[PDB]
Amino acid sequence: MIPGGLSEAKPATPEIQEIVDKVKPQLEEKTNETYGKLEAVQYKTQVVAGTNYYIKVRAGDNKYMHLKVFKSLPGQNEDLVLTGYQVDKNKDDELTGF
């Protein structure tokens, strides 16, 4: 049931820009780059032990940067983790199952 959401590339929102804005610092230390404002543009949801994430945020300049985070449904003050992320990505690159 629910074979990987990954529905159409939904339009980023204030909650999506928050997921990538929360991993912005976890990205410069996991890939070794100095990203910046990640204006979310699109994002695909997911499912498994809660709800993963997919986001194609712009890396400040015209550059971009996909994103992948996991959200715990249960738990108190959680901390969305950065499951993955496609550095140096563009707009022609779709998140798809990644």
Whichever domain contains 97, its CATH number is 3.10.450.10
* 41, 63 Cβ separation under 8 angstroms: no
Q: Specify the experimental method.
A: NMR
In whole angstroms, give the CA distance from residue 1 to residue 71. Answer: 19
Residues sharing a CB contact under 8 Å with residue 50, sequence separation 6 or more, in sequence order? 70, 71, 72, 73, 74
Number of domains in the chain: 1
In whole angstroms, give the CA distance from residue 77 to residue 85. Answer: 23
* 92, 62 Cβ separation under 8 angstroms: no
Q: Which domain holds residue 51?
A: 1-98
Handedness of CA 23, 70, 12, 98 (dihedral sign): positive
